[PDB]
């Protein structure tokens, strides 16, 4: 259960763009500065930049 500090604009066809305050079900946070988050609103998957999200 993380929160996108800011709306992230997907940079490639592997990450999902989120908004500020949007909840993101983190998945794998060991690949590096990019973790796989799953949006529950639509139900899609997409990596995400950790600098735009925060552990609440």
């Amino acid at each position: 259960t993380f929160v996108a500090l800011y709306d992230y604009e997907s940079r490639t066809e592997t990450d999902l763009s989120f908004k500020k305050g949007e909840r993101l079900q983190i998945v794998n946070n060991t690949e590096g500065d990019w973790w796989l988050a799953h949006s529950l609103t639509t139900g899609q998957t997409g990596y995400i930049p950790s600098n735009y999200v925060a552990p609440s």
């Binding site: 500090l5 800011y6 604009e9 940079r11 500065d33 600098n51 735009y52």
Partner: peptide
């Protein structure tokens, strides 16, 4: 390279 934070 993460993006530029707001």
């Amino acid at each position: 390279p993460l993006p530029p934070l707001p």
